[PDB]
Amino acid sequence: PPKKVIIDTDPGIDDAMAIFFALKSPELDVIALTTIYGNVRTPTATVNALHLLEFAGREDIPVSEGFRTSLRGELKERIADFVHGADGLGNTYPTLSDRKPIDTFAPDYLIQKVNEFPGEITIVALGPLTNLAAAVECDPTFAKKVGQIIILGGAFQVNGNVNPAAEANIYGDPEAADIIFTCGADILVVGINITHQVYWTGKDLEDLGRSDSKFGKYLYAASHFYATYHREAYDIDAIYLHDPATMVAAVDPSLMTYATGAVRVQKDGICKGLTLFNNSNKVWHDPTDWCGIPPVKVAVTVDRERVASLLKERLTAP
Amino acid sequence: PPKKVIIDTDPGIDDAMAIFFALKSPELDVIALTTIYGNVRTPTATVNALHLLEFAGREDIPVSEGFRTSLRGELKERIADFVHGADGLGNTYPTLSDRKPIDTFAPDYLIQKVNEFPGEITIVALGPLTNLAAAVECDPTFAKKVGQIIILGGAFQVNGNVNPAAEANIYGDPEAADIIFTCGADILVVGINITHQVYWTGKDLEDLGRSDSKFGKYLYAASHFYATYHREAYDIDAIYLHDPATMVAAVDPSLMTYATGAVRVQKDGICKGLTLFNNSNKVWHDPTDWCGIPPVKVAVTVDRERVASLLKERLTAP
Ligand SMILES: [Ca+2]
Numbered sequence A, B: 001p002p003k004k005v006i007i008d009t010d011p012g013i014d015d016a017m018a019i020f021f022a023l024k025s026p027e028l029d030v031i032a033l034t035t036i037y038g039n040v041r042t043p044t045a046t047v048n049a050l051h052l053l054e055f056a057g058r059e060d061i062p063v064s065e066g067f068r069t070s071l072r073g074e075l076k077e078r079i080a081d082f083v084h085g086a087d088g089l090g091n092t093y094p095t096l097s098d099r100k101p102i103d104t105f106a107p108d109y110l111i112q113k114v115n116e117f118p119g120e121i122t123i124v125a126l127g128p129l130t131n132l133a134a135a136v137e138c139d140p141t142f143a144k145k146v147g148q149i150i151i152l153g154g155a156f157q158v159n160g161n162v163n164p165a166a167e168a169n170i171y172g173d174p175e176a177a178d179i180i181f182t183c184g185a186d187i188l189v190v191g192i193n194i195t196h197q198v199y200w201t202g203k204d205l206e207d208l209g210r211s212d213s214k215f216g217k218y219l220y221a222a223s224h225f226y227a228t229y230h231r232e233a234y235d236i237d238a239i240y241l242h243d244p245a246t247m248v249a250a251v252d253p254s255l256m257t258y259a260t261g262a263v264r265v266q267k268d269g270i271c272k273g274l275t276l277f278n279n280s281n282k283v284w285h286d287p288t289d290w291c292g293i294p295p296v297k298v299a300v301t302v303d304r305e306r307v308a309s310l311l312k313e314r315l316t317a318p
């Protein structure tokens, strides 16, 4: 102990929460941060990630910029700001600096660091799986060299958040998602089916704002825009803790129950970005597209009280 | 009372069970039977349907042959016999018969009978929706003229039976299924999510065989092959009552709880034949492929004890 962690992020209010919680968790050693599109454009994500690490004081942590488009060159310029704001940090508009990313490309850096520490690195994917899929396509030995891949993505036997069928991160790059779910690495999938159970009320956010914590006060300011979205889209006085709940699985995986089986992603619409899990011990009078696919651990149940309490005692502590 | 019923079937051991139960239910008046592919080839389905009505004594009931291929001419010759047998009636090989179908094509007959009795006819679709979709494509006023369409098909937030994503009847013709779920008729969907709750153990089958009922004894003989399939595919000493549970909804719909919303079908693989339901409910910031789609009633919960008891007291009665 502690475990080495690389975080594939698109900051992102919920991403910032997860980044800060990882930096406040002694059981994790944040070795690096890799940026990707999603909530914000890849250059915006880099700017925000560099800024968050400056605020955290952990300036030692390198920031490696990744894919600006999808794996198959689908342009990711011009993206929705109704969830995370124009700046991507809930319209707080921080006074960002001149600090620059580590010039090495994120998939190239991912392969580099995993060969350096085989079976030690735990990649927490908090955005589209493009950077990870590129690393898999580049080096075929990458999948067996990674310690574990904790993915925030998918809607397992539940409706999606982008459209009724798909979840954001998977809808971002369905080709890249299918590559990862089939790559054969130690994979832990945290879908919206379980993140929708982990939420913080207006009072929980208020408690974080009132707290004498540098991070708690910061996150409360960014939360305002994210809270107004949930209030108009889901009509709830609470925010779903997507990315920070995924970070909890890296800290303590005992707080979740997992089901082992194969996961496949539909790449073409209407159901583009749909994640389908096969935990059906019916296996299978004629082979299916889930037959002979490496199994992955998919989170089924959460200890919502213990997850939300840990993501508070850490973010409220001075 | 009673309600006029047309049954779109592919007999089929479970289909035979539903046919017999409908013929033993005084609240339903089986006006006609329309054949389709699925478990068996369309000509085989016709032969079996004519035979079942002969055995039931109800020779007055016309049999109208339908589509031999999918709606878009996808050939349905050469189909799996591991579930219903070579004959389609659990390898019992009955002593059929020179009786012939009513020369009118099933979609043509469906439009004819619905114009004859508008808002009276209840179509119970126990096979692929090809015959019904052709009727919708032919006459646009058909959807509003039908009394109700009770569909056995789909896997709503659960794994499929053909492959982990799709259910048999919907996988048979995904184009036809999407036409029906969008047609705007009074639709009641009974998916495998609820039929997997309604099952009969080996003892239940034994009770049906021991019974002094013509139908019960017949169904027990055909059940042997269907039972051996469930024992090797699902590894259970029970058979899922798919088609007969759908017939129960026609008899007494109170035994099921329904959710109103839009249903769309994925036509191209990996998730070909997937049925996706949108709770409606749901506020969507940007229109989706479920927005502006006519809502349908989807069965959520069953009274498994009362469904299996009714499908026994009727099939055991002499
Ligand atoms: Ca994210």
Ligand SMILES: [Ca+2]
Pocket (backbone or CB within 6 Å): B009, B010, B012, B014, B015, B038, B039, B126, B127, B243
């Ligand atoms: Ca059937």
